[PDB]
Design a protein around this ligand. Sequence first.
Ligand SMILES: [Cu+2]
Ligand SMILES: [Cu+2]
Lengths: 128, 128
Amino acid sequence: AECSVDIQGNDQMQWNTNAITVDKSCKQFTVNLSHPGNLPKNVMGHNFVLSTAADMQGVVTDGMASGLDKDFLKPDDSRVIAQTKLIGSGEKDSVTFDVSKLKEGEQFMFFCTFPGHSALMKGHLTLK
Amino acid sequence: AECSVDIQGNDQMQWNTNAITVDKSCKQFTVNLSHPGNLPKNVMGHNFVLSTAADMQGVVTDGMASGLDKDFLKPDDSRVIAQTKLIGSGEKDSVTFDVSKLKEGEQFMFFCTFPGHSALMKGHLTLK
Ligand SMILES: [Cu+2]
Ligand SMILES: [Cu+2]
């Protein structure tokens, strides 16, 4: 039944969870990102970005180059399975993706592409 | 069900693969580690160490303190699911573990604890 997870990125560059498990029952999966901090998007913006483990470094690197006004994401980046907006304190964004995009046998990571954030704001997504 | 994997750690501190999928059909799984490089253990020693993604930091940190002569691993580290010994150029070691030690929705990482290597020699393992 459970095909969504609520995730928080705070003023300390921490996710409240570093592991998400997608039930193979789920045709679609929803990530509800919120920012419970006080700092604005230009200081402590967070996004939720999902890719293969192998692709994460390249997504982080090319996102950095794209800058704040592009949510630190390379536009139309085919390595990105799912992304939210970059959000600041008190904001929220959701993303729904087809679980068909998660291939059995792949390793997945989620991360924030705000420059410097992905060192601490990284987690692993798996299927149960 | 292939219930083993051949893994190489080389002189450029690369795994030949950064992703292992263990077939849920496997009661046991075997890692065959080789060092195809020419650098000896004291400069380019590799081990294969498997833990949860959560435990990897602690295992790597506690491993430093043990030094070369204890394979840069905390003795009897309950967080280590599987380990090989530390090997140098043209050496081999194998480890067999029970797949019951893995859980279907949990994230596992394999890494080398030779200080500095785990930045470049970190891979992801999941139960498929
Ligand atoms: Cu962030
Ligand atoms: Cu090594």
